[PDB]
């Protein structure tokens with residue numbers, strides 16, 4: 491029973507959620523931000539944190555330092571649409587006048603990390619990975635999506651003396667929606683770095699392999715009968731929408747891919763006070779962190795505009811921007827649908843992986 495007042499609940503503390511929480515905090519609008527972790531995860535640097543000693547502490551930022559009592563650690567199990575509540579594992583419910591859904595994507599470690607944990611435990615998880623990689627002479631990266639391609643390049647750039655094999659089910663690497671010129675140069679670069687590519691093969695004994703853990707001997711098998719002996723197997727396939735929090739309640743609304751369908755104001759179909767942003771929004775985009783932030787300014791503005799009776803603003807997708815990091819000294823990609831080269835990507839993404847951006851948003855300084 492909110493009797494006109496606002497109470498905004500942000501479910502998910504990723505790039506979008508912290509963008510929305512910071513906007514609401516600047517306008518002094520009551521809000522509660524919920525995340526299962528206690529710190530924000532700059533997952534765009536997760537692969538460098540998998541290979542560089544001491545980097546991982548640059549990639550987690552305490553929520554409570556920035557948001558204080560406007561943050562609440564918890565796992566969201568369900569939405570009660572009728573009574574405008576948000577159901578937390580353990581019983582607690584959070585009442586909202588407006589709801590921002592920002593639940594991001596789920597995937598294998600190290601590319602994603604969606605574990606309830608402390609900041610120091612999360613950091614330690616990546617430092618542990620680095621020791622697995624240091625220990626290993628032979629490493630297999632499974633999956634030539636954008637994540638595997640960068641993971642293999644990241645290992646070879648930091649450890650030229652390791653033997654890195656990348657195994658991928660198709661014949662072209664990285665996202666299908668990229669310029670063919672982009673996809674080809676990614677192959678050129680991986681080969682010049684000494685990565686051994688096993689294209690058009692599928693790993694067949696995967697349920698039996700130890701993941702993210704050094705072993706003296708591991709044999710990876712493919713459906714074509716190729717056997718690759720290795721010390722470490724890193725899995726880089728299986729990014730999907732994290733609908734844990736909202737699926738039971740919006741089944742009618744979830745598009746097939748897990749995302750919530752939305753209008754051009756990022757409103758969830760069938761609701762005027764429920765927004766979806768970033769990865770969980772059905773936008774036919776490639777799903778980018780920077781987009782998650784833009785969506786967040788859109789959603790907060792449209793909550794304020796909906797109270798101040800004003801025309802909502804819309805989200806106008808443009809041409810494809812995505813830069814692939816090929817280690818710290820190389821890369822390639824496209825900015826608004828045209829090709830950008832190695833020097834450009836190295837200065838934009840590959841040196842700092844946009845890490846300083848999240849620390850600025852969170853108003854904190856890295857350790």
Ligand SMILES: Cc1cc2c(nc3c(=O)[nH]c(=O)nc-3n2C[C@H](O)[C@H](O)[C@H](O)COP(=O)(O)OP(=O)(O)OC[C@H]2O[C@@H](n3cnc4c(N)ncnc43)[C@H](O)[C@@H]2O)c(O)c1C
Pocket residue numbers: 501502503504505506507524525526527531533534564565566567592593594595601603604605636637640729732734735767768769770777778779780781782813815839
């Ligand atoms: C895999 C990958 C992705 C890249 C990459 N690079 C870029 C890049 O250069 N630029 C960019 O803009 N995006 C890039 N992205 C995409 C970017 O990582 C994602 O699109 C971005 O993180 C999406 O932002 P969202 O806020 O939509 O989602 P997050 O996963 O960041 O945050 C979701 C949060 O919700 C929380 N959460 C979800 N369900 C929950 C629940 N039920 N209860 C509690 N918390 C929950 C999660 O724990 C997590 O903290 C990249 O190189 C790779 C390899």
